[PDB]
Scaffold this active site. Structure first.
Site, mmCIF file in Angstrom:
data_model
loop_
_atom_site.group_PDB
_atom_site.id
_atom_site.type_symbol
_atom_site.label_atom_id
_atom_site.label_comp_id
_atom_site.label_asym_id
_atom_site.label_seq_id
_atom_site.Cartn_x
_atom_site.Cartn_y
_atom_site.Cartn_z
ATOM 1 N N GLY A 73 -8.303 27.186 33.985
ATOM 2 C CA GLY A 73 -8.376 25.878 34.022
ATOM 3 C C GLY A 73 -9.264 24.881 32.938
ATOM 4 O O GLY A 73 -9.773 25.633 32.215
ATOM 5 N N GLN A 74 -9.144 23.828 32.934
ATOM 6 C CA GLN A 74 -9.790 22.972 31.883
ATOM 7 C C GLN A 74 -11.132 23.191 32.072
ATOM 8 O O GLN A 74 -12.190 23.438 31.069
ATOM 9 C CB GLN A 74 -9.382 21.342 31.952
ATOM 10 N N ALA A 75 -11.967 23.073 33.157
ATOM 11 C CA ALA A 75 -13.171 23.201 33.619
ATOM 12 C C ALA A 75 -13.770 24.608 33.266
ATOM 13 O O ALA A 75 -14.619 24.751 32.497
ATOM 14 C CB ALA A 75 -13.464 22.851 35.049
ATOM 15 N N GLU A 106 -25.692 43.830 42.232
ATOM 16 C CA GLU A 106 -27.057 43.623 42.971
ATOM 17 C C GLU A 106 -27.046 42.271 43.193
ATOM 18 O O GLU A 106 -28.115 41.718 43.943
ATOM 19 C CB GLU A 106 -28.065 43.787 41.589
ATOM 20 N N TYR A 124 -18.224 15.851 29.172
ATOM 21 C CA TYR A 124 -18.069 16.994 29.821
ATOM 22 C C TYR A 124 -19.078 17.883 28.710
ATOM 23 O O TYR A 124 -19.215 18.943 29.109
ATOM 24 C CB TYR A 124 -16.529 17.410 29.780
ATOM 25 N N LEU A 169 -23.611 43.732 38.673
ATOM 26 C CA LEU A 169 -23.157 42.637 39.392
ATOM 27 C C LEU A 169 -23.338 42.982 40.887
ATOM 28 O O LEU A 169 -23.402 42.013 41.762
ATOM 29 C CB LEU A 169 -21.445 42.491 39.304
ATOM 30 N N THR A 180 -10.825 11.939 38.385
ATOM 31 C CA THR A 180 -9.617 11.018 38.677
ATOM 32 C C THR A 180 -8.444 11.518 39.508
ATOM 33 O O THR A 180 -7.646 10.728 39.671
ATOM 34 C CB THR A 180 -9.070 10.543 37.130
#
Ligand SMILES: Nc1nc2c(ncn2[C@@H]2O[C@H](COP(=O)(O)OP(=O)(O)OP(=O)(O)O)[C@@H](O)[C@H]2O)c(=O)[nH]1
Ligand SMILES: Nc1ncnc2c1ncn2[C@@H]1O[C@H](COP(=O)(O)OP(=O)(O)CP(=O)(O)O)[C@@H](O)[C@H]1O
Ligand SMILES: Nc1nc2c(ncn2[C@@H]2O[C@H](COP(=O)(O)OP(=O)(O)O)[C@@H](O)[C@H]2O)c(=O)[nH]1
Ligand SMILES: [Ca+2]
Ligand SMILES: [Ca+2]
Ligand SMILES: [Ca+2]
Ligand SMILES: [Mg+2]
Ligand SMILES: [Mg+2]
Ligand SMILES: [Mg+2]
Lengths: 54, 437, 352, 421
Positions: free
Chosen positions: B10-12, B254, B224, B252, B179
């Site tokens: 996605g954009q985020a 841990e 952003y 990971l 939005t």
């Protein structure tokens, strides 16, 4: 107030301070979900087309 | 050495991922063309930074990352941006039309048609790994892709990589920069279906990052870019242990071992300090005590909530810069005598401390000032359940009237999935209450 | 135009505050579920603090301090006093108390009996009182067997504390009483003591040789007006105000209310509130809190003041609703939301 | 590349559509010959949404002009930007529709609709990824109303999963051509309730009152009314024509504005309505004022389900958030409390021609039921006496079809009423 497991290297170190002691869906099932939703979409569009044909 | 694959959805997730790899390159001395002079082993090596970067015969250091978005305009930025030379085309995946802020559209309608493609491009990265640890998945809660496609991707990853860990970096919806009205729906739908598939998730509330940018950076209306440069600093502090020599959070697995004693309660709270404006004439450098004490100030948390009225299950301190254990323990001693730090009785009252001597890197021309020492605290507090309550309440307000539900049912989702997801959140809220109250 | 919501329809205090706010013409009341509010007059139980301070562009304020129940709960107060270094176990203004859980459920049973056996052996007065927060349910007795058995018949936590056998008795009447002080803490954590207190007096002569009839021992306004036959005899509604009480202390004891009593009350109020300030302060929080507290004190025949309990949602004396409620608007609400003296409070300064 | 196909049908639809392309063509730097002569890259960033690119760097609107008589479209071809439209995209007959919904929908219109769909199909086949369609038309006539709603029906059959959007001009007795306008509008509204995702309700009465009272135009003309529609059409489409993430496409806009499928009728508004600078507080006060609304419904008579605001120009984005948050916090009794954060604000840097800054308002208000009530009452006043029905029964229609459209619109009114309480 105890410090344990002190590890040092050239780029840092880590340790642990203790202040007090204590007191899935298979690949097949995923396809069914995806196809079940695709079938409900098709059914809804068929009803729309049937309504437009009338 | 074991490799980590980062997935941006996605954009985020893509724009945050873009900011992280920018920072990763500056930290490891990698140029926009992928060259790393300090790397004396050309075309290979099992160094710590190789967990995130592969190498070609020409010495190029290529991120172990995939970018997925159902619309091409955001990933097109990466293809023509400063770091266009880092990634090859197979790593950047885009569709032609997005999920329209509709979880069902990203999960079912469009996800079903692109899931196999994404898994194929991930398999290519995995085949370059001699010992893959797992995945770091960046995404938003509110977007139709960030929410709907991520949950489908997490389900398939658990099937294709059963023994691999998966960590999330999730953007919690904030109306000040949102939005889309239906984001509470998407947030709860994607938490329900991702809960059993994520080993540890770091939620960042945009409301918190927004206020930190206005308060500490004096940005009247953060963008952003401002939000993402600050987020990538926290992300960097969290992943530094995987990319640099060390003994804490070296893999990971841990993160769950140290931060998540109960699987469903896997949402540690992140607190970061110091955030100093670069436009400042010149700031008095803060000490270990002051930055550590700042880790218990709500104003610096990634999610606004009150840890004084929760219970801690775990607590990690990740320092970067001029820090020695002596000063860390002194500051912690003083904080216990002043702060309200209540641990659960079935967990020791302690702190795992990690120190990396390399101070935080700041993007040149960015908003953040170069500081001599910084810390990120990862604490598993029941107090973060406040964010679930806020979100669940908004869900209830709309769902009581079935507002907007027809958009999801129109994409093939059943209405029962709404209530099934909400009941799972009600159970999640009860778990937090049983542990902390 | 500021906005507020009412979520406790049973509060006489904030029903008057709500009435004043509307009179100003600058405050508007919204439905209790409308999230776009500046001020919340919240409910007593399970107030949703977690949903406050997340409305963009709204400075939000609530009339309760999250975590102040630590002070306003019988069992919590005893625990806070014994475990907080600021108050210590040797605190001299709080009666010796113990937290006693019913046997059908840490617990301080054996610790209570030890202190009890000590008093009994040393010929000292050994009269204790058992009570709880789930009462309108009080028992006064000198035998430990009765105190413990009374709690087991119940199902909620209780507290057994020493009973002040030597209370200060007003004359004429030879009658007990207690002192109620109202204290307002604003968002900056200023401690304001309302200049007007009330003595809730017992209209029955105090009898030390009969704790079975609890009318002359319990000075609650409801007990005196229901089980007492001399209600309203000496003062209207068994409520003596500071002016009369002060004049009495001068004619009888040749001293003032400020010197003999009020200094200790102010000291006690400060100690309690300063103690929990780090835990409940909203200084660096995304929302602001204030709260009105009702402190209840006992005075013994030596003019020593004892703290009985703290009430987190107190009611006011009918004659003092106007003055105090207006005072809540001035310093608690208008200090954050200004409108387009001789303060009625006594600021108890302190170090933050 | 999210293309929108534009359709304009009938006299009203073609005259308003003409002005619309004239306005946005100026904003994008396109001259009457389709040659770009702007000076900002923001103009071409999303130019492909409404324009096709022909040889020689020519930008041709993706527009289809439809009418049952040639008159209006001859004027457009002779108008200012008439040469910019694709010559093949003019589809017209000779019979006319005589302000008769039945003629546009069942008889005359049916003869012509297939050739219109052939041009629609030609434009879609050249779209990288078609968003959907937007139709400009009136509801009070025959072609735009009757044939327009027939087009929507046949477009939805061939493109069932694309967004259908309309700018629909509602008739008013104060600005009326014939007495049968309530009949034509009531028949159209039912079509719209079923087959459109978004409909901007443009009331000719509101446009008139705004011209007479606010603009101080003694004798308003159709041209004056169309100036307000042009400005409004440009404001509401700004989110589609320039960069942004707030209602950036038709489906995302629909998802944020339509909580229930049938309640998709929007009240638009514009501000300002002569050289003085307009502050952000003034833009906001006016934009929410009923006098600036184009539907002729008092918002204080209902509640906003959702609101979308667009601010254009170089202004204080912080001061915008403050003023928007000031209108909501100062009148939250007109916003349904069961849709959190139902007011969304967007900012665009390029202002309209001849204005330092402006604001466009899009509201999904339950007060819109007042508009459907006026039409319903005018409909029933004639239908109870079966007055003027022979124009319609002569085209094959039966009285039952009027009885059902009447019930359908009264249902729509009742649906708005329940969400208002
Ligand atoms: N912190 C941060 N948040 C973002 C960013 N981009 C979007 N968001 C947030 O993410 C939410 C919207 O979801 P998106 O990620 O934009 O949507 P998506 O994943 O692309 O899915 P689509 O609906 O198909 O567009 C909103 O709450 C935004 O505030 C970003 O770059 N940084
Ligand atoms: N240790 C003690 N010694 C003497 N009297 C006591 C006492 N504890 C309580 N009392 C008496 O009990 C009365 C109030 O009891 P308590 O305050 O504990 O119950 P309560 O909380 O329901 C009344 P309120 O909350 O209104 O003050 C007082 O009037 C006081 O005289
Ligand atoms: N705003 C506006 N309304 C118009 C215009 N022309 C006609 N109308 C209105 O539209 C209705 C007449 O429909 P019209 O478009 O002329 O019929 P059609 O050609 O068969 O579609 C009446 O309500 C008129 O008031 C115009 O140019 N502008
Ligand atoms: Ca190497
Ligand atoms: Ca798994
Ligand atoms: Ca013919
Ligand atoms: Mg997107
Ligand atoms: Mg009480
Ligand atoms: Mg006409």
């Amino acid at each position: 107030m105890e410090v344990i497991e002190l590890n040092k290297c050239t780029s840092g170190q880590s340790f642990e301070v203790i202040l007090k002691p204590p007191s899935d869906p298979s690949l097949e099932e995923i396809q069914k979900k995806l196809e079940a939703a695709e079938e409900r979409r098709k059914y809804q569009e068929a009803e729309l087309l049937k309504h437009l044909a009338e | 050495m074991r490799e980590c694959i980062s997935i941006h959805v996605g954009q985020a997730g893509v724009q945050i991922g873009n900011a992280c790899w920018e920072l990763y390159c500056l930290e490891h001395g990698i140029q926009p063309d992928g060259q790393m002079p300090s790397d004396k082993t050309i075309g290979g090596g099992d160094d710590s930074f190789n967990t995130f970067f592969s190498e070609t015969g020409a010495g190029k250091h290529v991120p172990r990352a995939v970018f997925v978005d159902l619309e091409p305009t955001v990933i097109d930025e990466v293809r023509t941006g400063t770091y266009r030379q880092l990634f090859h085309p197979e790593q950047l995946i885009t569709g032609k039309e997005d999920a329209a802020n509709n979880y069902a559209r990203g999960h079912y309608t469009i996800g079903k048609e692109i899931i196999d493609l994404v898994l194929d491009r991930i398999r290519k990265l995995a085949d370059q790994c001699t010992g893959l640890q797992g995945f770091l998945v960046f995404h938003s809660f509110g977007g139709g892709t960030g929410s709907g496609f991520t949950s489908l991707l997490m389900e398939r990853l658990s099937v294709d990589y059963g023994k691999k860990s998966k960590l999330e970096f999730s953007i919690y919806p904030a109306p000040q920069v949102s939005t889309a009205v239906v984001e509470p729906y998407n947030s709860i739908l994607t938490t329900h279906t991702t809960l059993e598939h994520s080993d540890c998730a770091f939620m960042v509330d945009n409301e918190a990052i927004y206020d930190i940018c206005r308060r500490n950076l004096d940005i009247e209306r953060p963008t952003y870019t401002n939000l993402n440069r600050l987020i990538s600093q926290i992300v960097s502090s969290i992943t530094a242990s995987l990319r640099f020599d060390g003994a804490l959070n070296v893999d990971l697995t841990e993160f769950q071992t140290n931060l998540v004693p109960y699987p469903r309660i896997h949402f540690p709270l992140a607190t970061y300090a110091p955030v100093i404006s670069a436009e400042k004439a010149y700031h008095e450098q803060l000490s270990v005590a002051e930055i550590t004490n700042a880790c218990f100030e709500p104003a610096n948390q990634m999610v606004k909530c009150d840890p004084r009225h929760g219970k801690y299950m775990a607590c990690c301190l990740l320092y970067r810069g001029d820090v020695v254990p002596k000063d860390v323990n002194a500051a912690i001693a003083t904080i216990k005598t002043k702060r309200s730090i209540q641990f659960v009785d079935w967990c020791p009252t302690g702190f795992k401390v990690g120190i990396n001597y390399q101070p935080p890197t700041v993007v040149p021309g960015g908003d953040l000032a170069k500081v001599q020492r910084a810390v990120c605290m990862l604490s598993n507090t029941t107090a973060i359940a406040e964010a679930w309550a806020r979100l669940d309440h908004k869900f209830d307000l709309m769902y009581a009237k079935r507002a907007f539900v027809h958009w999801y049912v129109g994409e093939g989702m059943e209405e029962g999935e709404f209530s099934e997801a909400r009941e799972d959140m009600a159970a999640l809220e009860k778990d937090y209450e049983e542990v902390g109250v | 135009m500021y906005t507020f919501v009412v979520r406790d329809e049973n509060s006489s205090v904030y029903a008057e505050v709500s009435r004043l706010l509307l009179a100003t013409g600058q405050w508007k009341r919204l439905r209790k579920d409308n999230p776009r509010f500046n001020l919340m007059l919240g409910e007593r139980n399970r107030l949703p603090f977690g949903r406050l301070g997340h409305e963009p562009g709204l400075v939000q304020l609530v009339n309760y301090y999250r975590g102040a129940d630590k002070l306003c709960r019988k069992a919590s107060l005893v625990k806070l006093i014994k475990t907080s270094p600021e108050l210590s176990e040797s605190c001299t203004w709080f009666p010796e108390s113990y937290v006693i859980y019913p046997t059908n459920l840490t617990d301080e049973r054996e610790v209570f009996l030890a202190a009890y056996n000590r008093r009994r052996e040393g010929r000292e007065g050994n009269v204790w009182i058992a009570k709880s927060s789930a009462g309108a349910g009080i028992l006064i007795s000198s035998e430990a067997s009765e105190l413990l058995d009374f709690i087991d018949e119940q199902g909620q936590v209780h507290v057994i504390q020493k009973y002040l056998e030597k209370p200060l008795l007003l004359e004429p009447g030879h009658r007990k009483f207690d002192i109620r002080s109202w204290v307002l803490v604003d968002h900056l954590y200023n401690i304001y003591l309302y200049r007007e207190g009330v003595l809730r007096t017992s209209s029955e002569p105090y009898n030390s040789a009969n704790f079975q009839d609890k009318t002359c021992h319990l000075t609650n306004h409801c007990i005196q007006k229901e089980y007492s036959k001399n209600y309203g005899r000496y003062e209207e509604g068994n409520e003596m105000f500071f002016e009369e009480f002060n004049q009495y202390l001068m004619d009888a004891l040749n001293t003032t209310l400020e010197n003999s009593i009020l200094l200790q009350i102010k000291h006690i109020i400060r100690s309690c509130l300063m103690c929990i300030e780090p835990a409940i302060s909203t200084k660096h929080l995304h929302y602001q809190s204030f709260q009105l507290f009702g402190f209840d004190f006992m005075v013994d025949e030596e003019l020593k003041v004892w703290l009985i309990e703290v009430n987190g949602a107190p009611a006011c004396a009918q004659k003092l609703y106007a003055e105090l409620c207006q005072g809540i608007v001035d310093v608690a609400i208008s200090s954050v939301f200004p409108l387009a003296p001789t303060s009625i409070f006594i600021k108890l300064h302190h170090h933050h | 590349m999210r293309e929108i196909v534009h359709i304009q049908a009938g006299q009203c639809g073609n005259q308003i559509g003409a002005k619309f392309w004239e306005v946005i063509s100026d904003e994008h730097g396109i001259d009457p010959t389709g040659s770009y002569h702007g000076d900002s890259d923001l103009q071409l960033e999303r130019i492909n949404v409404y324009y096709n690119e022909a040889t020689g760097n020519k930008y041709v609107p993706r527009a289809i002009l439809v009418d049952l008589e040639p008159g209006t479209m001859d004027s457009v071809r002779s108008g200012p930007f008439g040469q910019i439209f694709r010559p093949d995209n003019f589809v017209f007959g000779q019979s006319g529709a005589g302000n008769n919904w039945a003629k546009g929908h069942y008889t005359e219109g049916a003869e012509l609709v297939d050739s219109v769909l052939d041009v629609v199909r030609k434009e879609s086949e050249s779209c990288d990824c078609l968003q959907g369609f937007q139709l400009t038309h009136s509801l009070g006539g025959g072609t735009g109303s009757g044939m327009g709603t027939l087009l929507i029906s046949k477009i939805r059959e061939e493109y069932p999963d694309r967004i259908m959007n309309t700018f629909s001009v509602m008739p008013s007795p104060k600005v009326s051509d014939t007495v049968v306008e309530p009949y034509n509008a009531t028949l159209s509204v039912h079509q719209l309730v079923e087959n459109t995702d978004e409909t901007y309700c443009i009331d000719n009465e509101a446009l008139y009152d705004i011209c007479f009272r606010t603009l101080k135009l003694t004798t308003p003309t159709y041209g004056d009314l169309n100036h307000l529609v042009s400005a409004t059409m440009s404001g509401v489409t700004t989110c589609l024509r320039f960069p942004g993430q707030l209602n950036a496409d038709l489906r995302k806009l629909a998802v944020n504005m339509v909580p229930f499928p049938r309640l998709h009728f929007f009240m638009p508004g514009f501000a300002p309505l002569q050289y003085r600078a307009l502050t952000v507080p003034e833009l906001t006060q006016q934009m929410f004022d009923s006098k600036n609304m184009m539907a002729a419904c008092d918002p204080r008579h209902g509640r906003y389900l959702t609101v979308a605001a667009i601010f254009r120009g170089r202004m204080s984005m912080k001061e915008v958030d403050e003023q928007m948050l000031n209108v909501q916090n100062k009148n939250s009794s007109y916003f349904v409390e069961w849709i959190p954060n139902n007011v969304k604000t967007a900012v665009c840097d390029i202002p309209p021609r001849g204005l330092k800054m402006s604001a466009t308002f899009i509201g999904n208000s339950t007060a819109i039921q007042e508009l459907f009530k006026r039409i319903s009452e005018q409909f029933t006043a004639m239908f109870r006496r079966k007055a003027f029905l022979h124009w319609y029964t002569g085209e094959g229609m039966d009285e039952m079809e009027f009885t059902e459209a009447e019930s359908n619109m009264n249902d729509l009114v009742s649906e708005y009423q329940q969400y208002q309480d």
